[PDB]
Amino acid sequence: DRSRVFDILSNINIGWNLGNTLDATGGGNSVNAETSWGNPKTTQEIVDTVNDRGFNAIRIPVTFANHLGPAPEYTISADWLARVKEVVDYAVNDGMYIILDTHHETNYWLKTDPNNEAALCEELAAIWKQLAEAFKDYDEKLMFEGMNEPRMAGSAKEWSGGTPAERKLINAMNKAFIDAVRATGGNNADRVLIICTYGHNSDEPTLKDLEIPSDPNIAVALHTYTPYFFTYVADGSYSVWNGSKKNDITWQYNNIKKYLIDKGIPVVITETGAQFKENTEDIVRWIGDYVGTLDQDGVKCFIWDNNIYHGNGEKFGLLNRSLLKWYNDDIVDAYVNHAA
Numbered sequence: 502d503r504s505r506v507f508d509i510l511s512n513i514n515i516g517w518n519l520g521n522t523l524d525a526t527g528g529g530n531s532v533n534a535e536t537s538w539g540n541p542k543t544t545q546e547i548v549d550t551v552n553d554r555g556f557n558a559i560r561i562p563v564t565f566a567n568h569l570g571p572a573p574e575y576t577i578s579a580d581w582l583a584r585v586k587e588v589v590d591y592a593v594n595d596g597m598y599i600i601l602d603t604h605h606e607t608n609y610w611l612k613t614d615p616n617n618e619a620a621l622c623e624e625l626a627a628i629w630k631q632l633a634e635a636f637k638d639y640d641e642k643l644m645f646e647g648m649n650e651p652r653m654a655g656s657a658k659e660w661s662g663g664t665p666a667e668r669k670l671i672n673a674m675n676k677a678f679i680d681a682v683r684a685t686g687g688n689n690a691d692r693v694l695i696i697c698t699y700g701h702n703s704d705e706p707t708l709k710d711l712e713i714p715s716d717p718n719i720a721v722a723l724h725t726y727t728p729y730f731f732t733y734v735a736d737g738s739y740s741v742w743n744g745s746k747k748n749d750i751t752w753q754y755n756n757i758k759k760y761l762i763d764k765g766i767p768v769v770i771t772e773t774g775a776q777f778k779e780n781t782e783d784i785v786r787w788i789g790d791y792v793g794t795l796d797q798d799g800v801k802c803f804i805w806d807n808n809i810y811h812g813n814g815e816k817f818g819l820l821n822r823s824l825l826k827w828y829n830d831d832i833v834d835a836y837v838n839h840a841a
C-alpha cells in the first residue's frame with residue numbers, strides 16, 4: 502500500500518519550479534551561482550507570491566556539481582548548503598509542499614555510462630547523504646527528487662529514453678538514492694522520495710524498463726511538455742491549440758496509466774509548461790487539455806518557470822520576480838484554477 506504518498510500529494514493544487522536559479526551553473530564554487538543566469542537572488546517575498554497565487558507546491562532545482570569537494574566525500578561547500586537551506590526555508594515558512602532535487606549534474610559527473618556504475622552511484626549517494634542529514638528534521642511536506650533528466654548528453658537516444666543498458670543503470674542509481682536517504686533515518690525514514698526514468702522520459706519502452714522499489718514511500722517523476730512541438734520552439738513547431746493534437750497527450754498519458762497509475766504507483770509531473778509564443782488563448786486551451794488529463798487521476802504537476810518572457814530564450818517565464826507581478830495572468834489563472 503502506497504496510500505500515504507497519494508495522501509500527501511493530494512494536498513497540492515499545482516506546483517511551480519524556481520528555474521534557472523539554484524540550478525544555474527555559472528559562478529563556480531560560490532553562492533553567486535544563483536544569479537549567474539540572470540535571475541535575481543531569491544527572496545521570501547518571491548516565494549510568498551508563488552504560494553499566494555495558488556501554487557502551494559514549489560520545486561527547487563539545485564545543481565551541486567561546482568559546489569562539491571573532491572571524491573570520494575564530495576563535500577557540499579558549507580555556504581552553498583546554507584543558501585539552499587535558506588531557499589527551502591522560504592517555502593517551509595509558508596507551509597508549502599516542496600521538492601528538492603539535484604539538477605544539471607548531467608553537465609558534469611552524471612553521465613549515464615553503464616561501465617561507470619559504481620562511481621555514479623557513489624557520488625549520488627554521497628551528495629544525498631549530506632542533503633538528507635541537513636534536512637533530516639523537516640516534515641513530510643518536503644520531498645526529495647534524486648536526479649533530473651539523467652542521461653548521456655549528445656547521445657543518439659539522449660531524449661528518447663536512452664538505451665536498455667542505460668535504463669538498468671538508472672534503476673541502480675534510483676536505488677542508491679533511496680538507500681542513502683533512508684540510511685540517515687529521522688524523518689528521512691518515510692519522506693517521499695521521487696525517482697525517475699532515463700531523461701524523465703515517458704515513452705513506453707522507458708516506462709517498461711523502470712524498476713519499482715518495494716519502498717512504499719516513493720513516487721515516480723516524469724517530464725511531459727506534451728506536445729513538444731506546441732510547448733517548444735523548433736523547426737516544425739506551432740503556436741495554435743485547437744484540440745486536434747490532444748491525442749498526443751492522451752496517448753502518452755495512457756502509457757503512464759498502464760505502467761504506473763493503474764498499478765497504484767504515485768506519479769508526479771515535476772516539469773511541464775508551454776513557451777510563450779504570443780498565443781495566450783492557445784496556451785490557456787492547452788492547459789485545459791493537458792492539466793485536465795492529469796486531473797482525471799489526481800496526478801499533480803509542477804510548471805517550469807525560468808523568469809524569461811520578454812527577452813531572448815525559452816519563454817517559460819510566469820512570475821516577473823523583480824516586480825512580484827505575473828507576466829500573463831490569463832495563463833497563470835488557467836494553471837492555478839485548473840481544478841475549478
Ligand SMILES: [Mg+2]
Nearest residue numbers: 687688690691
Ligand atoms: Mg518519523
